[PDB]
Amino acid sequence: MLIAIEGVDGAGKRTLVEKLSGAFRAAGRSVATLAFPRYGQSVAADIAAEALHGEHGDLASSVYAMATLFALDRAGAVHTIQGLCRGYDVVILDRYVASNAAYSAARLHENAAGKAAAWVQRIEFARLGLPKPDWQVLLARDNYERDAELQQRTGAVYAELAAQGWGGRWLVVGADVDPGRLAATLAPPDV
Amino acid sequence: MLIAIEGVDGAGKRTLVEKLSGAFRAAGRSVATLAFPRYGQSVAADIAAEALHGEHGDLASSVYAMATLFALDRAGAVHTIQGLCRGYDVVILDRYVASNAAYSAARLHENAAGKAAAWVQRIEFARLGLPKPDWQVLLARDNYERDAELQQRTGAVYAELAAQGWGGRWLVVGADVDPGRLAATLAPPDV
Ligand SMILES: Cc1cn([C@H]2CCCN(Cc3cccc(Oc4ccccc4)c3)C2)c(=O)[nH]c1=O
Ligand SMILES: Cc1cn([C@H]2CCCN(Cc3cccc(Oc4ccccc4)c3)C2)c(=O)[nH]c1=O
């Protein structure tokens, strides 16, 4: 059972991962988590963050370049994800491939059917062989405005991916989602 | 003994690697080679080549992005290079870190003391921990002109790196270099 938590609000996404983990562990199922990017454990992830803050020349001026770094991050964790799914009952990922497609398409002002989204699905799932997630849970100066526009675009792209079952079945939940009900819906009792 | 062969002429660089290998094997020393980028064995290297030919969106529009891909290529071969240097007497690399600095600086119209060159030395040797080479042997429509200018710039950057001992001692040789003399100069008899 590989579950990926997506959304634009990271602080709430982290909370949902905590409440969801406690619910699964309360039901007797073992849980293990992993957050992307893997800052401090992957050189590709650290480079991306550093490029964001002006390092590495023009590396940040290419959306696909940054997306590639993120994709390479998960590529190095493939055997780590496979190991967790074999030794644990539930594996919860804080952000996954869907994040790369939603934010990449938003930056390029594209939709779910855009070139950037299809490229993400192609390179990470088909070429890199990243495990397909069983569930993808969507949690619904002047620079302050240039950001809010990217969040709304990313959030809309998220809504498109979930509506079309991008990379697997989805499940849209609000911040007020009940953890017990969500964990019972993702992994019902009696297998 | 880690030896790196550099230069702008790849066809001649490949020949020098062959003649140099035969000379070392004639002296009783065992030899093993490895060429960068590692097309077909590294996903980062293949992505770079594919980006060159129009794939991966704008990934190719960033020099540092491509340089990062090349650097990540060698980063994955670090333990492979260390294994060869332990089981073989001589390890000859067809292109190495110096290539990334010479061509990157040439594309950005920079010199050896430019930002791009220093970045290559910083990220690949200091951060990624790539083994320092004992020797770095330098082999000295309208689009046909836009290329010849890059080769001369790269060749000049090469000349600068070798003159200042960039990343280690260098050795400039022409295509007419004698293989027996070169192998005797890089690894003299009697240790
Ligand atoms: C795991 C993941 C996450 N993200 C976003 C999710 C929201 C937070 N950012 C943080 C971040 C890190 C590094 C660089 C960066 O700025 C960029 C990213 C891409 C292009 C240009 C600048 C943003 C990363 C992606 O875009 N793709 C991913 O694959
Ligand atoms: C091993 C190596 C090699 N090269 C060059 C040595 C001369 C041949 N090219 C071939 C090549 C491959 C992929 C892309 C490419 O075009 C670029 C490269 C960088 C930026 C933009 C386009 C060229 C690679 C580097 O620039 N850095 C390296 O680290």
Q: How far apart are the first and last CA of chain B?
A: 11
Rounded Cα–Cα distance for residues A104 and A64 (Å):
8
Rounded Cα–Cα distance for residues B167 and A176 (Å):
57
Burial degree of A184 (CB within 10 A; 0-12, 13-18, 19+): middle
Integer angstrom CA distances of residue B64 from A75, A158, B32, B117, B159: 21, 30, 30, 11, 22
Method: X-ray
**Token digits of residue B131:** 């083994």
Give B59's DSSP letter. G
Evaluate: CB of B107 within 6 angstroms of ligand 2: yes
Rounded Cα–Cα distance for residues A182 and A92 (Å):
13
Length of chain B: 191
- DSSP for A119-185, written as a single string: HHIIIIIIIS-PPPPSEEEEE--THHHHHHHHHHHHHHHHHHHHHTTTTS-EEEE-TT--HHHHHHH
Rounded Cα–Cα distance for residues B94 and B99 (Å):
10
Closest CA to B92 of B146, B21, B147: B21
**Token digits of residue A58:** 């023009």
Integer angstrom CA distances of residue A79 from A11, B5, B151: 28, 35, 41
Rounded Cα–Cα distance for residues A11 and A23 (Å):
19
Sheet (strand A31-35) strand order: A31-35, A90-94, A2-6, A135-139, A170-173
Sign of CA dihedral B64, B66, B68, B71: negative
Give B136's DSSP letter. E
- Is A24 marked as binding a ligand? no
- B1-191 topology per CATH: Rossmann fold (3.40.50)
Contact flag A63-B58 (C-beta cutoff 8 Å): yes
- Is B19 marked as binding a ligand? no
A13 within 8 A of A94, measured Cβ to Cβ: yes
Evaluate: CB of B24 within 6 angstroms of ligand 2: no
- Within 8 A of A128 by CB-CB distance, chain B residues are 43
Residue type, B11: A
Integer angstrom CA distances of residue B69 from A121, B36, B65: 20, 12, 6
Rounded Cα–Cα distance for residues B29 and B13 (Å):
21
Atom of ligand 1 nearest to the CA of A104: 26
Write the CB contacts of A13 (distance below 8 Å, at least 6 apart in sequence).
A5, A6, A7, A94, A95, A139
Rounded Cα–Cα distance for residues A175 and A12 (Å):
7
Rounded Cα–Cα distance for residues B172 and B139 (Å):
6
Which residue in the set B44, B57, B127 is minimally distant from A116, CB to CB? Answer: B57
Distance of CA A3 to the CA centre of its chain: 10
Rounded Cα–Cα distance for residues B183 and B21 (Å):
8
CA angle A10-A12-A13, nearest 5°? 60
- DSSP for B78-119, written as a single string: HHHHHHHHHH-SEEEEES-HHHHHHHHHHHTT--TTSHHHHH
Distance of CA A41 to the CA centre of its chain: 17
Write the CB contacts of B28 (distance below 8 Å, at least 6 apart in sequence).
none
- The answer for B 48-87 residues in CB contact with A (under 8 A) is 51, 56-59, 61-65, 68-69, 72, 75
Burial degree of A189 (CB within 10 A; 0-12, 13-18, 19+): exposed
Evaluate: CB of A42 within 6 angstroms of ligand 1: no
Report the gap between the CA of B58 and the closest CA in chain A (Å). Answer: 6
Nearest CA to ligand 2 atom 16: B52
Distance of CA A134 to the CA centre of its chain: 13
Rounded Cα–Cα distance for residues A138 and B85 (Å):
49
Burial degree of B5 (CB within 10 A; 0-12, 13-18, 19+): buried
B28 within 8 A of B90, measured Cβ to Cβ: no
Q: How many CA atoms lie within 13 A of B191 on its CB side?
A: 0
Rounded Cα–Cα distance for residues A99 and A93 (Å):
11
Write the CB contacts of B139 (distance below 8 Å, at least 6 apart in sequence).
B5, B6, B7, B9, B12, B13, B16, B173, B174, B175, B177
Closest CA to B24 of B88, B82, B90: B90
Long-range contacts of A25-30 (CB under 8 A, 24+ apart): A27/A183, A27/A184, A27/A187, A27/A189, A29/A89, A29/A90, A29/A187, A30/A88, A30/A89, A30/A90
A131 within 8 A of A78, measured Cβ to Cβ: yes
